[PDB]
Design a protein around this ligand. Structure first.
Ligand SMILES: Nc1ncnc2c1ncn2[C@@H]1O[C@H](COP(=O)(O)OP(=O)(O)OP(O)(O)=S)[C@@H](O)[C@H]1O
Ligand SMILES: Nc1ncnc2c1ncn2[C@@H]1O[C@H](COP(=O)(O)OP(=O)(O)OP(O)(O)=S)[C@@H](O)[C@H]1O
Lengths: 387, 392
């Protein structure tokens, strides 16, 4: 479908996107740096330092990656990078943006620390997404968020680690898929036990969901119980119950763990697993249909290698003119992308439909089907492979 | 990849796939019936009647569906088909082959009852897959447990039961399993003495659940009543203790003080549902990269469309596009023989599509002149020339 296709068109387009007038310094291992930031203002609330986001191409493999730059940071200990990235690089999770390495650079005309993450096109912060630069969220979507975050914490926690940074602005959204996008950063900048940090995780978890449910971006100390009571008419009591459990501190004799929360999740984990599957299935049928592009592109390779290098190949020449050199009555071009598309669709299927191939010298004209032409193309292409 | 390319084409070929000499009769709304039974033998153990499987194309929408034929069933009551399919038609679940309708027909030269299901290409029965005509990994077994649990959850919350729960009636396709005989016994037992309650029937599901997994785990197709506890102690060394505990919980009838529900099983599974959920998600992501690649192919094809339109329509700035085409596809070796290289073709057009800043050398027909040019420059010459033809 169209929305799915235009989403994919927007993803591929974001990756190629550049800014011809931009002046950002090329790194030793990176080039084509592109800004990901959506506003012109930066605060040090999130990191303790100003932050910049960029899309860049790797010089060695050419793939695109995301770089989070921390402004005004000087390395005072090579252990702070090495003792953190050694643990976080290993963590691979569908709801955590994977980090690869961390290094300092001086190319920004200052001292910056640079983290590399997987680049996810069209990702926008969960904050900006539910609170635009200027109603209520379905409960199902809220449960989608809880399950995804639960999946992440289970894995982080299975590594004797903690998220530390768990906020609306550091979780990326892309078609209802959310990921933790600031991992391993506070781990480095700070050099306090992991368990208490793990407990704060549950707390930060709760405020994020609570914020979305009550439609309030900024969160205060005073309404952890007030805003908790605004959700009972709009949402189920089960929802309010989970939020209450994550956010409230005590857990007096047996402290909060992810494994205990899961039974709390229950059907939504099963339901959720069902949803991702319905989605993986829908992509499967959508994939098979696109396979034609590969079949069509591969046909164009063959036709172009053969053309213009005589014989049976004359028809193939006459065929290209038929597909692409069509003109209107005044001599004006009859550009029709659909025509290009439909000829090749028919060529790929070895369609039995017939066409008229007039030579430049009009004395001879060939009546032929797409099937025959298709068989002719592979033939000529195969004879070039013999030598 | 080779496997990814080959698996998906095998799906599309199977949906369209034919057998001309079959002699099979078109129904009131269906045509082009293609047989799916892979074996030459039929027993009436599963349904009580011989069964036949077909793929058929719908007369109205042209889409393919699977039809399970029950040979020799005479309709004695319409309430049997309405009362059942109205509840099951409502259920949409990824581990359940969705059922649409049920009707009788006489086109087979007899009395047949027909169920229509969604058609899932390249599907094979869980039985034939693991027991064809060394250990099954534990990860895969939990995947089956999670999927079946997912199905039972949806079924049970609909005040229904699986009824049909066997290896031969579950289809496997790339580690994805689905129940493929649902709503049938609902019909075939719709009219019989001593009916069990949906509550009692729901309990049998759990028992059949355990036996299926147990069967895969003990790698014994045939399972007997005497080894429900015997075959159960062989898996603690091969498999984890959690797994044995769950099978025991599912299979044993007793439900000693309370009877078993899926909601209770779910909490028993715990991390394995997350593991599974995490896995399906990553696999769904990989399809996204393959998807984008194919969409990319569309962009490459659209570039060559433009390029083919311009070429042989020249000199000037279009002479370079002509020379670019020679550069990409008319490459020859030192001997003079053609140098076919799809990779060369591929990487050139990728660079053309990205408006790469990389430069390449374009030699003219006459070996005297060579153009130092970038893909970006080539790209801008290409789009500029293509736009100027729509202007006239
Ligand atoms: N792995 C990633 N892949 C792609 N885009 C990403 C990735 N991680 C982050 N982003 C993008 O980078 C941005 C990071 O968020 P920020 O720009 O720091 O939020 P912000 O609030 O606008 O800026 P502040 O206030 O200075 S933290 C998001 O808008 C995402 O779109
Ligand atoms: N809903 C379905 N969609 C696609 N293929 C299906 C479906 N249901 C069953 N099949 C295929 O049916 C084939 C065999 O059908 P079955 O009736 O389940 O087994 P069988 O051994 O051929 O027949 P009997 O009578 O049980 S011995 C399997 O290889 C499956 O791929």
């Amino acid at each position: 479908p169209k929305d799915r296709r235009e989403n994919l068109q927007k993803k591929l387009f974001h990756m190629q996107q550049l800014l011809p007038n931009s002046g950002l310094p090329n790194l030793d291992r990176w080039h084509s740096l592109f800004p990901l930031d959506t506003k012109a203002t930066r605060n040090s609330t999130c990191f303790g330092y100003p932050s910049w986001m960029y899309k860049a191409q790797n010089n060695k493999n050419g793939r695109h990656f995301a770089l989070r730059r921390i402004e005004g940071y000087r390395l005072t200990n090579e252990k702070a990078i090495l003792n953190v990235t050694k643990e976080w690089k290993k963590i691979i999770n569908a709801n955590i943006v994977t980090v690869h390495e961390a290094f300092t650079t001086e190319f920004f005309g200052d001292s910056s620390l640079i983290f590399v993450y997987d680049f996810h096109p069209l990702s926008e912060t969960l904050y900006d997404h539910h609170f635009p630069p200027n109603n209520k969220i379905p409960e199902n979507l809220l449960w989608s968020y809880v399950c995804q975050i639960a999946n992440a914490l289970l894995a982080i926690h299975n590594a004797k680690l903690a998220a530390r940074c768990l906020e609306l602005s550091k979780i990326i959204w892309e078609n209802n898929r959310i990921r933790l996008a600031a991992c391993s950063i506070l781990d480095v900048l700070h050099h306090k036990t992991i368990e208490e940090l793990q407990q704060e995780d549950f707390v930060k978890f709760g405020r994020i969901i609570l914020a979305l449910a009550t439609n309030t971006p900024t969160l205060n100390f005073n309404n952890i119980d007030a805003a908790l009571a605004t959700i009972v008419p709009r949402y189920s009591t089960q929802l309010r119950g989970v939020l209450e459990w994550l956010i409230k501190p005590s857990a007096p004799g047996e402290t909060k763990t992810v494994e205990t929360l899961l039974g709390g999740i229950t059907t939504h984990l099963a339901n959720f697993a069902n949803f991702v599957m319905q989605e993986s299935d829908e992509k499967e049928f959508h994939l098979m249909r696109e396979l034609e592009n590969g079949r069509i592109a591969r046909l164009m390779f063959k036709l172009s290698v053969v053309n213009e290098r005589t014989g049976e190949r004359l028809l193939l020449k006459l065929f290209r003119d038929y597909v692409f050199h069509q003109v209107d009555a005044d001599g004006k071009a009859r550009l029709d992308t659909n025509h290009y598309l439909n000829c090749l669709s028919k060529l790929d299927a070895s369609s039995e439909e017939q066409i008229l191939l007039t030579s430049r010298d009009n004395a001879t004209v060939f009546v032929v089907s797409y099937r025959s032409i298709r068989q002719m193309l592979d033939r000529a292409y195969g004879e070039l492979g013999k030598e």
